[PDB]
Design a binder for this molecule. Structure first.
Ligand SMILES: CCCCCCCCCCCCCCCCCCCCCC[C@@H](C)CCCCCCCCCCCCCCCCCCC
Ligand SMILES: [Cl-]
Length: 117
């Protein structure tokens, strides 16, 4: 498991805030974490929200690739550059839909490393 245990407490405050703002359930998060996602704002806006909280996207859901790479471990760098080559730039009807399209693209491209918190 590439995910470090320190991240969980780090994201806790923003996670609670993002769920409250968007009407997100933990069941929805569990579902996307397992690779199942639909274009429901309560989960897609949650994903945008948490990314934004950690400066991974801007006000139009453009991804900050350098920040993203900075967060991932060494054994994931080339894979990430490859996945971002396929999945960026983001597109969609709004910020939440941009993140929906991104999620699927990434989950489809790297299912074994996918996770959502
Ligand atoms: C190569 C595989 C890619 C990763 C698989 C999907 C996970 C992507 C998660 C995005 C950031 C993950 C980094 C979390 C671990 C970093 C630990 C460092 C601790 C200090 C920083 C803590 C915070 C900066 C964590 C930020 C967590 C944000 C979670 C966002 C959840 C929604 C993501 C789904 C949307 C698609 C992501 C699309 C972005 C990914 C493109 C390229 C890999
Ligand atoms: Cl982008």
């Amino acid at each position: 498991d590439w995910v470090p245990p320190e991240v969980f407490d780090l994201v806790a405050e923003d996670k609670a805030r993002c769920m409250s703002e968007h009407g997100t359930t933990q069941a929805q998060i569990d579902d996307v974490d397992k690779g199942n996602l639909v274009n429901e704002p309560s989960i897609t806006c949650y994903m945008y929200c948490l990314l934004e909280a950690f400066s991974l996207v801007d006000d139009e859901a453009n991804v900050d690739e350098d920040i993203m790479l900075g967060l991932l471990p060494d054994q994931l760098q080339e894979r990430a550059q490859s996945v971002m080559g396929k999945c960026l730039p983001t597109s969609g009807s709004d910020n939440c839909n941009k993140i929906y399209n991104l999620a699927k693209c990434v989950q489809e491209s790297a299912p074994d490393v996918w996770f959502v918190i």
